[PDB]
Enzyme design. Structure first.
Site, mmCIF file in Angstrom:
data_model
loop_
_atom_site.group_PDB
_atom_site.id
_atom_site.type_symbol
_atom_site.label_atom_id
_atom_site.label_comp_id
_atom_site.label_asym_id
_atom_site.label_seq_id
_atom_site.Cartn_x
_atom_site.Cartn_y
_atom_site.Cartn_z
ATOM 1 N N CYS A 1 -59.703 27.117 11.522
ATOM 2 C CA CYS A 1 -59.720 26.432 12.835
ATOM 3 C C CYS A 1 -61.172 26.458 13.253
ATOM 4 C CB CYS A 1 -58.735 27.044 13.865
ATOM 5 S SG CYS A 1 -58.790 28.869 13.981
ATOM 6 N N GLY B 1 -61.408 30.662 12.954
ATOM 7 C CA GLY B 1 -60.665 31.222 11.817
ATOM 8 C C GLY B 1 -59.809 32.440 12.259
#
Length: 302
Positions: A226, A229
């Protein structure tokens, strides 16, 4: 107990005692307490991430990979060129089923592709937008159709095809290094389940279903990121892990969402980061237990 009995006990328990918001908050607070204790006990040091040469490689100063589970680089190795903000996460059968990493920085784009290449990753799951709340959350490491090759040092990346689904895009990327070409599949998930909509978990389960259509097994790591993370990355990891247990008939008699998330958070810091995320994992897991019970019920009809 057999799997049916273990699954049914989880289902009966969920049905007979609904978990409240306060309960979820109390559970998440114990997870945070464990992290405090582990920090005080120096259980999981982050010395490599903290090195001066590596500070600029971290998107968020608070999110540093534990040393013991960090992904080390060696492809075309500078002395700190071994470092990336990423951790291996164990799968149901063994280590390194997943790589949980941050959205790359302009300074770590080459490092990102070195990682992907070195570890023979096929699948990349991106669970963020480029921009969120007006801030840039991830640098462009992928190619799109019509763009030809993008170049990240010696890696050439192009996009053959995009499949656009409701809430995500599956990009078929072609990556060239040293005259070798590999196919990589990037799943770019550009929505997220809504706390106030029970049916909004369906697309996340669909995402993970499709992922496992492209790689059913654990031969090479799946990269999940993302922005940091952690958070969304951890949710995906946790649901996938659980679904693998379900599908393979290996849910342990002591299975709990609390223990699952505990386990994750010891492999990358804050891997699931918020109570809302914790709740999403619970709700998704319960739906998966229901779905697996149906599989059992239909097999038992013979």
């Amino acid at each position: 107990m057999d799997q049916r009995e273990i699954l049914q006990k989880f289902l009966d328990e969920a049905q007979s005692k609904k978990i409240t918001k306060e309960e979820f908050a109390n559970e998440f607070l114990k997870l945070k307490r464990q992290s405090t204790k582990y920090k005080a006990d120096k259980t999981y040091p982050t010395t490599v991430a903290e090195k001066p040469k590596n500070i600029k490689k971290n998107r968020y100063k608070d999110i540093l990979p534990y040393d013991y589970s960090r992904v080390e680089l060696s492809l075309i190795t500078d002395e700190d060129s071994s470092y990336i903000n990423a951790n291996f996460i164990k799968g149901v059968y063994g280590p390194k089923a997943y790589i949980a990493t941050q959205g790359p920085l302009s300074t770590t784009l080459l490092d990102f592709w070195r990682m992907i290449w070195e570890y023979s990753v096929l699948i990349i799951v991106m669970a963020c937008m480029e921009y969120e709340m007006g801030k840039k959350k991830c640098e462009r490491y992928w190619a799109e159709p019509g763009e030809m090759q993008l170049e990240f040092g010696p890696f050439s990346v192009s996009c053959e095809a995009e499949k656009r689904k409701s809430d995500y895009i599956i990009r078929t990327l072609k990556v060239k290094f040293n005259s070798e070409t590999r196919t990589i599949y990037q799943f770019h998930y550009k929505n997220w389940p809504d706390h106030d909509v029970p049916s909004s978990i369906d697309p996340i389960l669909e995402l993970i279903w499709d992922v496992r259509c492209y790689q059913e097994d654990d031969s090479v790591p799946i990269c999940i990121h993302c922005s940091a993370g952690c958070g969304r990355t951890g949710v995906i990891c946790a649901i996938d892990y659980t679904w693998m247990l379900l599908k393979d008939g290996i849910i342990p008699e002591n299975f709990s969402v609390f223990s699952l998330i505990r386990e994750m958070r010891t492999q990358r810091p804050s891997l699931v980061q918020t109570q809302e995320q914790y709740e999403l994992v619970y709700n998704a897991v319960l739906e998966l237990f229901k779905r697996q019970m149906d599989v059992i019920r239909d097999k038992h009809s013979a």
